[PDB]
């Protein structure tokens, strides 16, 4: 249980967490 996600799955969470991360760099360093 809880391990059908992937090893991509951190990943995703990754080019994920920066891509927004961007959308926010966008409102904190501009």
Same mark, same amino acid.
């Given at each position: 249980? !809880? +391990?059908?996600?992937?090893?991509?799955?951190? $990943? +995703? /969470?990754? /080019?994920?967490?920066?891509? /927004?991360?961007? $959308?926010?760099? !966008?409102? /904190?360093?501009?």
């Amino acid at each position: 249980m !809880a +391990t059908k996600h992937g090893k991509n799955s951190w $990943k +995703t /969470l990754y /080019l994920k967490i920066s891509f /927004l991360g961007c $959308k926010v760099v !966008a409102l /904190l360093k501009r």
